[PDB]
Structures are given as structure tokens and as C-alpha cells.
């Protein structure tokens, strides 16, 4: 990403367009979007014992 100079000379007309594409830091985006997933592991008390 750097600046530059455009110099145009002569009869006529045209269109200039400049687009930058890059990696932008995430906007606190959670990869677990749309899902509230909860996992719990616990030893069994005495219900089996």
C-alpha cells in the first residue's frame, strides 16, 4: 500500500479506480457464530456405585 501520482495529458475523458485488498483484523468475530455449544464432563457420583 503506497501512494503515487497520476499525470494525464491530451484530449479525451476516462475513469480511474483504485481498490485495495488486504487482511484486516477480525471484528471480535466468534467462529462459533449462531450456536451456543456447551460441553460438560463430570465423574458419576454414587448412582452407579
**Residues written for the chain:** 49
Compute the distance between CA of residue 17 and CA of residue 22 in angstroms, rounded to an integer.
Answer: 17
Question: What resolution in angstroms, rounded to 1 decimal?
Answer: 6.2
Contact 1, 24 (CB under 8 A): no
Contact 3, 20 (CB under 8 A): no
Grid cell for residue 27 = 471484528
Could you tell me the sign of the dihedral formed by the alpha carbons of 40, 46, 47, 49, in that order?
Answer: positive
Compute the distance between CA of residue 12 and CA of residue 9 in angstroms, rounded to an integer.
Answer: 9
| Buried-state track 2-40, b at ≥16 Cβ within 10 A, e below 16 | eeeeeeeeeeeeeeeeeeeeeeeeeeeeeeeeeeeeeee
For residue 4, give the nearest of 25, 28, 20 by alpha carbon: 20
Amino acid at each position: 500500500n503506497e501512494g503515487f501520482t497520476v499525470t494525464a495529458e491530451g484530449k479525451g475523458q476516462g475513469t480511474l479506480s483504485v481498490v485495495t485488498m488486504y487482511h484486516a483484523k477480525a471484528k471480535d468475530q466468534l467462529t462459533c457464530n449462531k450456536f451456543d455449544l456447551k460441553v460438560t464432563i463430570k465423574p458419576a457420583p454414587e448412582t452407579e456405585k
